[PDB]
Symmetry: C2
Subunit: 212 residues, 2 copies
């Protein structure tokens, strides 16, 4: 719009630059960084309060044991496997710690996943049946096929897939996205191509098949 | 040598061409095809006898249930997961059948893996301890790192890794090789680069991390 009363924020607004330049390069370079600009300041304090509840030794950081022990929004809990996936996604420094800014990303990611869970649990509230996994993952940007969606339900769930199992699936898909980023940063594979969600979906189908 | 008495066979000898051109394109195009030229004719009949023992419905082909039920050389047995990996490696036609030529490859692969198992089970006969997995896989051509070798022992074994568990590991590494072949055949990633075992080793490290 060119309407004065309805002006939308632009990506990379000058007002955010101060904050952005102070952030660690690892954080700024990562595929999930744009999650950070979706969070209003007024939710900052809520997320920070949550962070404090998970940070059991008050280190100002989250370690894998804290993720395994933590309660997250919507009653989400993480198995040891899933806590490790969250570390591999969000500890972009590879130091074994999740910083507050890294947790903010993880929190938003979990809230996106939770929203799609509730939206796609239509046959039975609080569970995803196998046929609901495909659309929920597509909505999140993971363009997989039916074969793959049924394989993920089988690997990560039982009849139905509860919220925790859904978050496990989403963490696997996101860790594969990080792995993809790492692989294609290797200069052996030529100049880095822009991300193509359809091509990445095919990559995710293939890597999923390696899990069985 | 230029010695008449000690002439070595050359790869792609004219005498094998008749056979090679009659083979299905899927088989000829696959990364494991050179396994086939390592098998002398006199072992043909032994492998065929073994094939017949696994082929329970005499279809002239092996299906996944036959792999799950089959006994292979060295007392090797395949879990459901590993039988499926063997299908993903060797059913290059994607028809759900392993042909005799596809089984020949699988048999040779298993014999290579079995030989390295016996060679590397030094601390205790009939088992690989975690530190023996790294050299055995390097000997097979899979250039992984220590982190990865210990992750594979953890994922696929217990204290020690028996033969069947080792074959499971080898099948995972080989299925990842097939996956790599498939991924890099996609024209999105540019002209296909020649295979580089060191670069592939790094790829295997990364994909291994996705299994936990
Ligand atoms: Ca802490
Ligand atoms: Ca970190
Ligand atoms: Ca059969
Ligand atoms: Ca076949
Ligand atoms: Cl589909
Ligand atoms: Cl190493």
């Amino acid at each position: 719009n060119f309407c004065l009363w309805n002006l939308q924020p632009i990506q990379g607004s000058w007002m955010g630059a101060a904050c952005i330049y102070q952030m660690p390069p690892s954080v700024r370079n990562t595929w999930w960084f744009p999650l950070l600009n979706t969070i209003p300041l007024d939710q900052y304090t809520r997320i920070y309060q949550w962070f404090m509840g998970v940070d059991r030794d008050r280190s100002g950081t989250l370690e894998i044991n804290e993720l395994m022990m933590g309660q997250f929004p919507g009653g989400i809990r993480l198995s040891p496997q899933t806590a490790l996936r969250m570390m591999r996604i969000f500890d972009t420094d590879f130091n074994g710690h999740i910083s507050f800014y890294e947790f903010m990303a993880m929190y938003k990611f979990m809230e996106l996943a939770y929203n799609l869970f509730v939206m796609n649990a239509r046959a039975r509230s609080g569970t995803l049946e196998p046929h609901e996994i495909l659309p929920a993952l597509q909505q999140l940007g993971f363009y997989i096929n039916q074969r793959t969606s049924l394989l993920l339900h089988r690997l990560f769930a039982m009849a139905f897939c509860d919220l925790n199992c859904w978050i496990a699936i989403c963490a696997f898909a996101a860790q594969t996205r990080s792995a993809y980023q790492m692989i294609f940063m290797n200069p052996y594979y030529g100049p880095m191509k822009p991300f193509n969600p359809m091509e990445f979906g095919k990559f995710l189908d293939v890597v999923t098949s390696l899990l069985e």
